[PDB]
Design a protein around this nucleic acid. Structure first.
Ligand SMILES: C/C=C\C=C\[C@@H]1O[C@](O)([C@H](CC)C(=O)NC/C=C/C=C(\C)[C@@H](OC)[C@@H](C)[C@@H]2O[C@H](/C=C/C=C/C=C(\C)C(=O)c3c(O)cc[nH]c3=O)[C@H](O)[C@@H]2O)[C@H](O)[C@H](O)C1(C)C
Ligand SMILES: Nc1nc2c(ncn2[C@@H]2O[C@H](COP(=O)(O)OP(=O)(O)O)[C@@H](O)[C@H]2O)c(=O)[nH]1
Ligand SMILES: [Zn+2]
Lengths: 83, 208, 99, 385
RNA sequence: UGGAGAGUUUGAUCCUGGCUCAGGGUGAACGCUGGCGGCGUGCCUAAGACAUGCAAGUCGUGCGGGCCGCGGGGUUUUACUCCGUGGUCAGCGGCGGACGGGUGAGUAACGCGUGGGUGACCUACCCGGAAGAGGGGGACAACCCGGGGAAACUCGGGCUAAUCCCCCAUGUGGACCCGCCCCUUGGGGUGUGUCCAAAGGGCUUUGCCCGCUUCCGGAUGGGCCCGCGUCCCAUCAGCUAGUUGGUGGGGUAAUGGCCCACCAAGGCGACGACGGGUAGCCGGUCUGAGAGGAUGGCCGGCCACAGGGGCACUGAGACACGGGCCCCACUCCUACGGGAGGCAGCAGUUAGGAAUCUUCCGCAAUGGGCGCAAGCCUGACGGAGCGACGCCGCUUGGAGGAAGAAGCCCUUCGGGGUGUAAACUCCUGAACCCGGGACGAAACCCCCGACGAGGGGACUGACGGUACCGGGGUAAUAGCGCCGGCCAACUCCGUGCCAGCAGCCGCGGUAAUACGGAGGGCGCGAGCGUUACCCGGAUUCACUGGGCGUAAAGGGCGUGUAGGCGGCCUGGGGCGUCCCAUGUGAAAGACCACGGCUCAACCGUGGGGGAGCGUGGGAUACGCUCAGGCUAGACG
RNA sequence: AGGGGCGUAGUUCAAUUGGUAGAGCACCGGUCUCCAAAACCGGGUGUUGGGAGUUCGAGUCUCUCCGCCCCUGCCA
């Protein structure tokens, strides 16, 4: 089913993921359905994570199954936090 | 890598007295003060009328020999200067000047550029705190270059920082003689560098 | 040398044989109905045709004919059958065919 | 479906010799089938093997002939002792001679003469007479002929007893024992030389194979040091230049070896090397250990007629074939101003000019053969080129 | 924000015109030479043949057994061994093996690009909503026993469990025939008549968690159809019987001659049908002032194939790379009756070739499948290795140091050159040495709170004792091409149309800046040359941007088919055309700004272009079209 | 690795009568010319594939090597 995972970009020994709502089957770095954010696992910049608030939620409210370590980031971005 | 070899030999060939030694190339024997003619077995013979090509080739060689850069690197800068906005003439010179190893020489520290290179390469220099050993490092505006602490005692940093008592630096670079510093205030201009080189004639060399 | 793929082949032959039969039934049972629907056997026609129609939606339950494949087979039966009865002979027992 | 090889008992290289059509080739097929009962898992040289109860074995069954010398002579240098075969039907025939005198020239220590074809024409003298002519022939070539384990027995019969039923323990044949007599008495008398595994790697090449699915394999007896998978080596000699690669396979008698030490015919798959790219006369060694050379000076001694050699001498500009290891390359002779008439029995120091580059190295010995006879022998002095 | 030309036809000149060169590029290969690192990248040929090992499994929280170690001995002892609980070998059942990974053989085609259509369709798992889950019967494995067999495995009798199978009911609802209303290709509503549902599993148990069933909608992914676009030969000109249409059927999820009866004679073609050759297409890439030209390797999308060829089964999906059946070729085993396999998966071999890598380490990260979860599997992937194959960075030293050693080379025998070069003196300290030593990893999970939000806690690193930092620390690699002109760089000797050079013009016949060496010089440098191919220069296929009297080029001349082109005034249309809005134009790449690895190369974030084509709205000069009028063309 | 063949001037070929090496094309000097071609004078121009062995002497008869062709060999 549709999901919300991380597609690896950057280069060797320099990971730079792109948080996206692709489709389960797509290859990891294949054609995705929509970019909603990115994540710099080495926080080598005062912005190692950004996410589309309105959008992440949209996809969630329609069947997008967040990846394990993916959700971890959506959460930290304040996706679920309903107050 | 970089040239490495008889240098006043180039001071000669090119016609214009070049400074590739700092101290000597400044005395009564830069060779251009003894044999102001090309090297080799001929050198002092009837110089035929230089072909339009020769002229440019020489002009370009002159410029690139001053900074002791390799043709590869040298070209890239030029090509790089083209794409960028503004007269390629100046821009090129600018970039050329922003070269750390050279910025060092420009601020004292090093008597020559061949020496200035070994300094940057062996550590002794610093950029906004951390140290850079890449001669090709490109210094931007607002950056302060400085000798390393462990270096501040070396027998050379002294003399070379000593002769800097008085001698002012380019209107695009400041200098704290006591606290081995220096800032790249502004990007140097065609004028500021009284170089014995015709840029808009070197730009011609890279066409046909 | 081998794999638990086999578990799928064996499993394959089995259910291949399951709906293989469920299928041929609907067939022999669909003809038997029309084979009468034109004789005039109005009553026992719908009787059988009503049986056939069951077995059809039956296979549809599982991976035999799922959806429309069943719907269609029906339309064509409750079509050919009726189209043969009105070939002289009112529809006796209510049967499946909607009056 | 391959199987590993585990070490414990010492290794040793042997190989039957003797006159053609005597017994060598079959007794070998005998010794093998024999030591395979009490030991579970057992025109061109045939490296084959059998393991007793005290040591591991190689064994070379060289064809032998005034035609296949070259092939033969090689295998000799690679062994620590030969099983000189002799037939009770004929005796010390010419080939038997040739082989011994040759087995001597190529170094080689001790011999274990096996009197095959004993089961034929019963004679009081014959059997006992032979033991004489041999010891007379062995010393006639300065061998310890008056003290060389002389076992007697008929191999042919020994073998045919094995084809009936595989398993056959000690002496269950007044026959299957003279073999156990030679086989047993063989691991005796002929010791175990000093194998130095401290020196840099170097293994001359005997035969080269192209193992389907794996690549080119180079077989030879490691002359010093050791090699395991992942070891870098150099193929030095006979080529444009010395090609370098890494070893990715080492095996003992068709079996996965772990670290093949010095003194053991091991095969080695070489990383990415085509077959026409590796041949004999080459040597696999440690990077930097030894280089390719053409010209050199050597302290050669020229045998006198008496000992085979020439009997007329040779002047400067002579073209013989020099043997370094598994090789035999030709070369011109050009030396000192004078030393011209260098007739038989001299210790001159000339200069060779081989037409094919071979892994020379000051300290290495060699031999010279011209006209079907070892005209001389010596050692590499100083290297010119 | 973007355009350079030169050599060569002549005694000389101008023109025409071909040839050749300087530029950039490449998955390269070959020669000479070769120190370090980072990031890329590496069978272009035989879609040849391939040893071996691995590349796809997972659930006992679906079910019944075998078997091993242990709670307590059913009885009172090892009896009908209940069951306790964690294991393990299959079996049954389920979800995944249709993804991910490889290749470019085929294919000139709705294959692909692009924009649309589907009132002609499907979509497992994932969300949202509705209503349910009540009765009942049965089978086959496994296991016990018997049997044939070399093996792979196979046959027979008989127990048995389920979320396996079947019958009945409930009918929220859905399917089908007919009638009706709306609607318009088969969509939506309604009435009457038939037909159709479902499975229990774990708990911390009138409640949860995981499932099950029928329906509706969302998502995502797809099928089918359509307009326009997509190479060479016309020395290939006519092609067509399921052929083109129809009617009724079969078939499919669905349209369709997709398939089949029967009927009708059509359908296609110089706007290039049919046939032959070649080729996967695209985003892009190289070049180019641009327009173009060339190309389609790595990365991303689509298609096609899985030894050659045909076929169906299971299934939400395959006519299925590590599933099945059959034929064929080839490889191997055989107890000769039948057996086994398919690297265009990773790695490795061999053959072919000018030529293209380790049978490496790890699931730590990202991603996938199954699982409540723990977790298992993952040659996807993250890494390391080999190769100057490429791009970027770095080193082989720095400052002193003679009207200037030697050696070698010239020499008008005074001297000039190599040359500050060396030596020598100081100075720094690539390597190496000792010490410290990561980022990538915070979630699954546990705990407080409701296992929600939020807060807290624990484990986990293949690369690697690597990067990087500190301290110590030795002067420590240089080659290749070229020097007649084009084209930067000249002298001596040898050679004597020889030997040889040569991209073009051309050099060599006894004073050769052209051959070979030397001295010297120029160019570039861990490289430098060579060959091959593409663009450029070549306005030399000329749309931009050419030509035909004599340079190559006017058809031998009429008449005329298709086609192209079309005077003056006015009005309708608004197809071309032009304008505005809007949808599309994926990502990466390119460009620009700023950042992150000490720089750069690489890399991230953001920003701006954009023809095409769909839609709605508008303009009407010109073109077109319709209509009316005109007489300057033309005809009478 | 082992069999069997071939190898003579620059080039095609001679002495299977074992006594130094000979023929045509070709080439090299001389006259001549700027240098050739032509004409005229005059010249064998050889690692008999190498190196050894017999022989008083070897192209020839023996060996052992080199390169090339051809036939078989060859999974640690
Ligand atoms: C000989 C072939 C290859 C050699 C290869 C190399 O040799 C070696 O270099 C070797 C190193 C010393 C070497 O150089 N070998 C090279 C040389 C070595 C020579 C050594 C030892 C001697 O000493 C003088 C030694 C044999 C000596 O001779 C005597 C014999 C005399 C015989 C006379 C002949 C007689 C009666 C006879 O009937 C006879 C005959 O036999 C043949 C033909 N026709 C005849 O009518 C006696 O027996 C002594 O023992 C190494 O061994 C290498 O490792 C190698 C094996 C690779
Ligand atoms: N008389 C006899 N003949 C034997 C014996 N051993 C072997 N043979 C035979 O001798 C012949 C040659 O034997 P082979 O092994 O070929 O000897 P090689 O090959 O010359 O070493 C064959 O026929 C063998 O069977 C034996 O002990 N006695
Ligand atoms: Zn100077």
């Amino acid at each position: 089913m549709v999901k919300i995972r991380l597609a690896r970009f950057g280069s060797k020994h320099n990971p730079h993921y792109r948080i996206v709502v692709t489709d389960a089957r797509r290859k990891r770095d294949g054609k995705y359905i929509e970019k909603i954010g990115y994540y710099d696992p080495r926080k080598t910049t005062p912005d190692w994570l950004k996410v589309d608030v309105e959008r992440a939620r949209y996809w969630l409210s329609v069947g997008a199954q967040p990846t394990d370590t993916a959700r971890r980031l959506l959460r930290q971005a304040g996706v679920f936090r309903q107050e | 890598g970089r040239y490495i070899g008889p240098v006043c030999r180039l001071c000669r060939r090119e016609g214009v007295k070049l400074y590739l030694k700092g101290e000597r190339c400044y005395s009564p024997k830069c060779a251009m003060e003894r044999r102001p003619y090309p090297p080799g077995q001929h050198g002092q013979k009837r110089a035929r009328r230089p072909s339009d090509y020769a002229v440019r080739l020489r002009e370009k060689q002159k410029l690139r020999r001053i900074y002791g850069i390799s043709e590869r690197q040298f070209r890239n800068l030029f090509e790089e200067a083209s794409k960028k906005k503004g007269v390629t003439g100046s821009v090129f010179l600018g970039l050329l000047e922003s070269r750390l190893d050279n910025v060092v020489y420009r601020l004292g520290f090093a008597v020559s550029r061949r020496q200035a290179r070994q300094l940057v390469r062996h550590g002794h220099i610093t950029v906004n705190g951390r140290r850079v050993d890449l001669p090709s490092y490109r210094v931007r505006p607002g950056d302060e270059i400085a000798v390393a602490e462990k270096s501040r005692n070396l027998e050379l940093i002294r003399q070379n920082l000593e002769a800097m008592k008085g001698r002012k630096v380019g209107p695009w670079l400041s200098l704290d003689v006591e606290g081995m510093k220096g800032k790249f205030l502004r990007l140097p201009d065609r004028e500021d560098l009284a170089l014995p080189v015709n840029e808009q004639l070197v730009i011609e060399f890279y066409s046909r | 040398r081998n794999l638990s793929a086999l578990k799928r082949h064996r499993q394959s032959l089995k259910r291949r044989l399951r709906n293989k039969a469920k299928k041929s039934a609907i067939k022999t049972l669909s003809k038997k109905a029309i084979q009468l629907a034109q004789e005039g056997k109005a009553e026992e026609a719908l009787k059988i045709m009503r049986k056939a129609e069951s077995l059809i939606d039956k296979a549809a339950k599982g991976s035999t004919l799922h959806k429309n494949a069943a719907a269609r087979r029906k339309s064509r039966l409750m079509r050919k059958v009726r189209q043969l009865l009105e070939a002289a002979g009112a529809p006796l027992i209510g049967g499946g065919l909607s009056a | 479906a391959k199987g590993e090889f585990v070490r414990t008992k010492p290794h040793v290289n042997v190989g039957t010799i003797g006159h053609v059509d005597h017994g060598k080739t079959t007794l070998t097929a005998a010794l093998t089938y024999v030591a395979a009962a009490e030991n579970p898992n057992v025109i061109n040289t045939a490296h084959v093997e059998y393991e007793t109860a005290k040591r591991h074995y190689s064994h070379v069954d060289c064809p032998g002939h005034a035609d296949y010398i070259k092939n033969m002579i090689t295998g000799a240098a690679q062994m620590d002792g030969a099983i000189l075969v002799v037939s009770a039907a004929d005796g010390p025939m010419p080939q038997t001679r040739e082989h011994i005198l040759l087995a001597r020239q190529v170094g080689v220590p001790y011999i274990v003469v096996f009197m095959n074809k004993v089961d034929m024409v019963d004679d009081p003298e014959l059997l006992d007479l032979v033991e004489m002519e041999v010891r007379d022939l062995l010393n006639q070539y300065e061998f310890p002929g008056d003290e060389v384990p002389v076992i007697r027995g008929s191999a042919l019969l020994a073998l045919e007893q094995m084809h009936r039923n595989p398993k056959t323990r000690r002496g269950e044949n007044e026959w299957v024992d003279k073999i156990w007599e030679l086989l047993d008495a063989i691991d005796e008398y002929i010791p175990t030389p000093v194998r130095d595994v401290d020196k840099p790697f170097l293994m001359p090449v005997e035969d080269v194979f192209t193992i389907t699915g794996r690549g080119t394999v180079a077989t030879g007896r490691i002359e010093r040091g050791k090699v395991k998978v992942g070891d870098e080596v150099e193929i030095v000699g006979l080529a444009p230049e010395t090609r370098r690669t890494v070893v990715t396979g080492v095996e003992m008698h068709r079996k996965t070896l772990q670290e093949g030490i010095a003194g053991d015919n091991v095969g080695v798959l070489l990383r990415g090397v085509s077959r026409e790219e590796v041949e004999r006369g080459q040597v696999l060694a440690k990077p930097g250990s030894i280089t390719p050379h053409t010209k050199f000076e050597a302290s050669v001694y020229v045998l006198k007629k008496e000992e085979g050699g020439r009997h007329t001498g040779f002047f400067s500009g002579y073209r013989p074939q020099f043997y370094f290891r598994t090789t035999d390359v030709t070369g011109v002779v050009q030396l000192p101003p004078g030393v011209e008439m260098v007739m038989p029995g001299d210790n001159v120091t000339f200069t060779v000019e081989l037409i094919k580059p071979v892994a020379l190295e000051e300290g290495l010995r060699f031999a010279i053969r011209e006209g079907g006879r070892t005209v001389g022998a010596g050692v590499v002095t100083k290297i010119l080129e």
